[model samples]
Target: HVGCSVDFSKKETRCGTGVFVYNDVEAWRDRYKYHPDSPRRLAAAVKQAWEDGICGISSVSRMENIMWRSVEGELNAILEENGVQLTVVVGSVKNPMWRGPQRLPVPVNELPHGWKAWGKSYFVRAAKTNNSFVVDGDTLKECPLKHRAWNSFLVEDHGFGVFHTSVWLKVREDYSLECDPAVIGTAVKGKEAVHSDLGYWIESEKNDTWRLKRAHLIEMKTCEWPKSHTLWTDGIEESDLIIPKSLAGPLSHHNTREGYRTQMKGPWHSEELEIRFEECPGTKVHVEETCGTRGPSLRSTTASGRVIEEWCCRECTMPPLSFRAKDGCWYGMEIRPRKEPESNLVRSMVTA
Candidate 1:
């Protein structure tokens, strides 16, 4: 479906591209190429159409040769038909974080917010087998693959046209801080559930300064709008003339335009959200009292609960780390792995 329109009557302006994308646009073309028999005239036609505004020329056509085309071609054709000169301002980031492969199908209870096939096909899982979670590390040897014990990753639009990436950790049980240690596992097994946001701390080197433009909201309206509304009422509606409301309402909404400030919780212990950065070793050298001139060293959590420093190569710093707050509180700690189990002091938690 079409999104909000531009006020063409006004002068030329600068704005980011919309979320709805066509395969032919920029980076997307790398993944979605054109058909071999696609017409050469289509390119010229699109350019000319953009030069001369056209109407009713969409990226997809239901009744003619224009069954499918690139975004550029579609916009150009529509502009040409309408005789309206327009500029398609391509955003620096072509796709939002959430617009990738491997997504959570809409949940069953949240069916109205998801597509028709989503509730039945989608499943959630946990990331580890230990009572604790593994973060900023590569290995997942003990991570559980159970659908109920797993968490899915998501990329979100941070706002101001900036798209941020994150992950959602799902928990199936509920537990209070005062619960007995012995029954904690049982309670969590029965009634605990949680989701963790893992992307708020990513520091994109492409943009030098850190600025979160906004948050991504999976609004029910936007999701359903992009699909065929005509078929929305098919088996469910009694009358053809009356418009049918979407079966699923909007599911996810960003509480604020600013980055997420919530904590991770639940059996997965993902209620507290954490954001930090870890660097690879050997990229830089450090001076250690015991191991002189070490290639890299582990950084400790500061009083503020942020990682003070870590080792890294000059060219590429490791990705920043992020976590959710638990019970409205978060604990900061470093999660460096080793062959033999180490003492908890090596990775002690810091109160936030």
Candidate 2:
């Protein structure tokens, strides 16, 4: 139900409108490397429209991935230079697990870094219900069929979305937005579990031809995870692991094949602490010694803390002598005993 109007006088008549889905700009460039209407050209057109104060950008995601950051600076500059205000709408999924987060084409937090900084000025994040479509400023005030329900009707049900158009928006060649009116109107009807009531109205009004092409359809593979492995099971499940009253910190858990992988953040430099895994009996704990690109050496310890097996990365003949942190500082520390002590070793004996 969101609406807006944009002057398309500055837009290229051949391209219709400057409405595009912000997916992977790099991927689009790669896919259309040989095409005359390449990704860069498309982006340039959109940028030109913004510069001329004729367009605006919008996006929607599961709140993952910063790919849009690639163009944030340029777009912001254009909007600022043109003396126009930009609007952004974020739609949150009601049931994230219903479609499975992993099945999404991009990550969960994909908003651009620029948006993160300036989104407060014009951004609105709301839970999506019947409508879930983000619009460019041009169609922000006047477009009626601007929601995902309409998008689904034309794309999934009718097969006439952005990707199906003559100058379709595509990414990585395999994924294309299908929003061509000709394609959608003639596309064969299909059935799905969820059907929009607006679809019937869309079909009935097909001859009227209210063309406002601005929907994106990403290619995604759907799969179901075992209910037991999922975080939600129609109800909440509590953790069974018991932590000592003495040890306290932020605990994190990730689902693993064997069981939940729990770890306490920060340095665990307390006195000799005996950790027990009573939830899974006969569990073999692998302690990592030395970490580097060559891989870490793992020492398998049984329930009784007895070393049952040991394995080292075949590619790593020497244990790591230094480690680099995210801050770009190299902390040179020896984790394992060196074959030759520093007193006995000379510069000529070391290999880079």
Candidate 3:
């Protein structure tokens, strides 16, 4: 695995002593360089390479294209359009104190408030209805992938502008922690069962410092210019048609703006909801002794959107986190995703 040499987004024969890649945006152009006409040939070339065993070494190579923090959905579409498999490169570290596979930082059944949970996507706004107000992602450290400036899945504007509205969009949107574990492993025997948010990685570096900014809810009903059944969505607009019956929904994917996926339960209307506004129980973390000097190393685990460390391009499957190894110096380790053995469900939708 160490000797493998290839880069999917290579330019001018570089990225990693590329075995087949030769120029920008083509999978493998070395052989087809002169007589080629169809991108289809090269497109199939990537898949062909994956079939032949290059998929194992494609960890860094897969994300070499994203300049910075792009949305998972956008990135996935980009690969399929370019003729690669619609697969995710799941990265994880190896620790000697080893346990079973790592658990998602948050669980679906027990979602901590202000952390991430599912139930509903709602609207948030400031009192800026007079001029213009925005629910700045600058605080939450997330935004639209269109600009890719911050970590976010979707965004928009209106009476406050619903930042990232949770939707009934995924094939597994209703999943719960209690039963999902039973289902997570079924993907191989039945690996084709689709899962969303699997590709959207958590920006741990940013989340390590992820801050939450709160704005009070403004009931959007008329204080009455005497009497009206209209909603303004805020304090200053002509009017709207819907009533302010509920502020939140039944499940939310807001924190899902990142990944590994967990949604908090909701439909919280009563100010009497006994839900705990608790801090995250903290992530699974352990520090190791330094091996030496410059990089004493095998230390601990280490994401995205203007990253200071890993995922500068804001990609998922955070790699090279702390992994304990048997070697005296192999303190940290990482597992890049391996190729799916063989599957037919996805390729069925291959591009023409």
**How much lDDT does each candidate structure score?**
0.22, 0.23, 0.19
Q: What would the TM-score be for candidate 2 when compared with the true structure?
A: 0.19
Top-TM-score candidate index = 2
TM-score of each: 0.18, 0.19, 0.14
Query: Highest lDDT, which number?
Result: 2
Residue-by-residue lDDT tens digits, candidate 3, 48-167: 333442321111111111211122233233345554444333232111101111111111232111212222134222121121111111221222212211111111211111223222
Off-target runs (Cα >4 Å) in candidate 3 are 1-45, 58-72, 79-85, 90-352
Residue 215, model 2, lDDT: 16
- Rank order by TM-score, top first? 2, 1, 3
The better candidate by TM-score, 1 or 2, is 2
- Alpha carbon deviation, residue 279, candidate 2 (Å): 20
- Model 1 stretches with alpha carbons more than 4 Å out: 1-29, 34-70, 94-352
**Per-prediction backbone clash count:** 68, 25, 20
Model 1: per-residue Cα lDDT over 163-250, one tens digit each: 3221111211331111011101100112221111111111111133222221211110101211221122233322111111221111
Provide the lowest-lDDT 10-residue window in model 2: 192-201
